[PDB]
Structures are given as structure tokens and as C-alpha cells.
Amino acid sequence: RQAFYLHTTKLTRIARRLCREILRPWHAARHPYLPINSAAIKAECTARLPEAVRKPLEAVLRYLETHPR
Amino acid sequence: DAVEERVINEEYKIWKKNTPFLYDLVMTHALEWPSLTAQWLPDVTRPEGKDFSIHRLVLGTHTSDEQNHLVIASVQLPNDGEFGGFGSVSGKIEIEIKINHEGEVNRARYMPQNPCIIATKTPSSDVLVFDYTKHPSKPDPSGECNPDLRLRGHQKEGYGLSWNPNLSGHLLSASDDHTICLWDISAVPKEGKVVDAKTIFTGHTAVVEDVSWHLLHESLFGSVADDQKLMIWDTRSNNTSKPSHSVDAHTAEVNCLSFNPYSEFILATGSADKTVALWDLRNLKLKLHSFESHKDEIFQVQWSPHNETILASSGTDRRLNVWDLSKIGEEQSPEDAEDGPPELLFIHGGHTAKISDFSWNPNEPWVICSVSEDNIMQVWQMAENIYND
């Protein structure tokens, strides 16, 4: 199987943020085997080109022990 | 079967074309032989003038007809208007060291107090220890044992192998007779090359799968086994036939455990029942959470060294899942609910065969190396817009 290297370009990184609503990363991240609509993303990125804090572990454990299984 | 192979190939092509939108880094490499083990060493060298750093991995070989090797590989990692980002891998992943090893390397783990010392787990009940500075980097060829039959004479050996990070040279392993060995290799004699166990812990009634020292409490360790139990042991206890705590962790074999590196009380276990369980040592009669999404057995689970609420799991299925504890309880659209619970942050689809082991890079956040039965080693990092959002 052919070996490869990918260091994602700065443009692709900003496209992913710009076209959040098309890409839907939360959804794509759990669907490796679905084709992402790259065409749509590239279009809307080229068109719109002219322009996160985490809960502590302590807090997640507090949530869990107060929402038992 | 040929049909399933074609499906897997089709799905790999889709994944590969998706990579720029799911990842910031993907590096792949076909090993000569599949590795059942992978662990990043802690050192990183940063060659002056270059826009990359050098990182190193302990790997091994699983072959039965050829000379096995304990392997150390180097990996080049990038320092921080066109789409994509594909390039050549040539020379980015190189083998630095090969050391002849008798059996297959089932697991290899470096000693935290001196990372030149690697312990290995063989399919027999012996554990071998190597200082890779005391061998040549390329060995001469080896004389292979060609038994016309090999009659096997022991129940399975679990791959459990953990160095105590607070007591130099104290090493736990899962033996082949339902027990756990403890060796102390600090101040072993000069002449003596063989070392017998300081202690044997009996307790499990089936193949012990994994053991791990606690990261803070020097006398605590955990173990898991095919008897469906998690067991917490204390080396100070006089009774080595019974552990301090015993939990019915799962409804099938328990293959692995991992302590959370930012909390003395939290750990996770992984099982043949297809779940990862979350445990608190202050109340082990209560399971805190169950991560269900995996399609098959869990064999490895590892906490992020950089993020207290992040962990990853892998096993028989070709996918590796990344979980974010902080998203537990979050609202989802009904559509996103079908994809899985919100705490499933990322599904890594790059492998086309069972994932044998994986390791979070201790020096560059979100970088993972995973190795599979197909011979492939992948070093990867999911896209920042997934992990910062």
C-alpha cells in the first residue's frame, strides 16, 4: 500500500474554519469513510476569502457522579 | 474474503482523500514486519536550521520464520494559497537501531529512569532487558531455529509490562499462569545475568492481560484479566494471594488499563465486551462511565499526556477512537446522535487491519503513532479545528 506524507496547508486550515457549515467537522470526524464535499468547500472558501476553553476534569467528575448510569 | 478486502480498500481511498480536512499531519510507512508494540521515547532532538524535530519510537517485529528485532525508529515532525498538503515521506521515518531478539516482541517498554533500557515481553514467561547503547546499531544476520514442529505447552501470556516510574528498576509483568511477577533489577550482581522474581501476586483465576503501576503512589499497581476483574494491589501488603480491591469490571475479558496522569484517583479499562470503563479508586463499586462505540474488542487504551480529559482506545477493529470526557452530557442534534455520543471526538480510519498498539507523542500534542497487523505504522495528528472546538 502506497506510503504518504500530509502536512496540511495554512489555506486548508482556514478553509476548514471558514466553511465550518459545509465541512461539519464534528460530523466528519466520526465519518472517515464518507466523502467530504471538498469541491463545495473550495468554492465557498475562494468566494469568502476577503475576511476553545475546556471543562476541568474535576468538573466532569462532578457532572458524572451527579448523573449516574 | 476478497469482497471484504475490496470494501476495505475502497474505504481507505475515501479516508485518504479526506485527510486534509480531518488531519494536520499524516505520515505513513510500511515496516518489513508488523509491530505489536509502539512507544515514543521521551527525547526530542532539534537540529539547528531545520524546520523539523526528530522523535523516536520503540517498535518490534512479530515474524516466526525470520530473525526478530527490537527496533528504534526516528521520525521527523514539522515545527509550527493552496489546498491539500501532500508530499513525499522519503527519509522522514528511518530505522536507527535493530537488535536481535529471540521470540517475537509482544511488547516493549522503556525504563522511565533511564530510557536506554528497554524491557521486552516474549511469548514465553521470560522478560528480556536490553540497553541499546551496549549493542551495535545494525546486527549481523542471525542463525534461526527451524523446529520441524513446536509443541506449545502453556496457556497464553498477556502482554502486560510496566516499569515503576517512582522506584528505579521495579518491573511488573503478566505471567503465563494467572499470576503477576515483580522484579527489582536495581543493584543486580555483576556476574548474574539471570534474575528471579522478587514477588509473585496470585489472585486472578485466568490469563492476566495487563498490569500498570500507579503514576504517583509507588506501592500501588492495577491489573486486569480474562476473569473479568480489575484488581488494585499494594506491594506493602503481606498477603500476595489477595489484592487490596477487586472489581467485576466487565462482562468479558479485560485486556487493558491506564491511569489518568493528572488524577491519582482516575483510571480506564478496556474489554472484549467492546467498552471502555472509567473508574475512581475512591469508589470502585461504582463504574463512572462506559464508552460504547467500538465495533469490536478493546485491546489498548491510553490517556493523553497533555489533556486531562482526553483518551484513546483501539483493538480488533481497524479504527482508533479518541474520547473527550468534557463533552459527556452535551446536547446533540438527532442526526449527530446517530454518529455516536458527543464524547466520541474523533475516529481514525487510516488503518486497514487490527491495531496492535499506539502511543501519544509526549512532546508534540495530539500526535499519535499507531501500528497495525498489515505492517503499517502511521504517525498522525487530527485537525486543530476538531480538538479546539
Author numbering:
A (entry chain B): 468 to 518, 529 to 546
B (entry chain A): 10 to 89, 103 to 411
What wording appears in the published article?
The nucleosome remodelling and deacetylase (NuRD) complex is one of at least five corepressor complexes that recruits and activates class I histone deacetylase (HDACs) enzymes and directs their activity to chromatin. Metastasis-associated protein 1 (MTA1) (and its closely related homologues MTA2 and 3) are up-regulated in various cancer tissues. RBBP4 and RBBP7 are WD40 domain proteins with a characteristic seven bladed β-propeller structure.
To understand the nature of the interface between the R1 domain from MTA1 and RBBP4 we co-expressed and purified a complex between MTA1-R1 (residues 464–546) and full-length RBBP4. The seven bladed beta-propeller fold of RBBP4 is largely unchanged by the binding of MTA1-R1. The first 10 residues of RBBP4 are unstructured, and similar to previous structures of RBBP4/7, the 14 carboxy-terminal residues are not observed. A notable difference in this structure is the stabilisation of a loop that supports binding of MTA1 (see below). The extended strand positions a number of non-polar sidechains into a groove formed between the amino-terminal helix and adjacent strand of RBBP4 that forms part of the ‘linking’ blade of the WD40 domain. An important part of this interface is the 5G-loop that wraps over the top of the amino-terminal strand in the R1 domain. Interestingly this loop adopts a very different conformation in the structure of the MTA1-R2:RBBP4 complex.
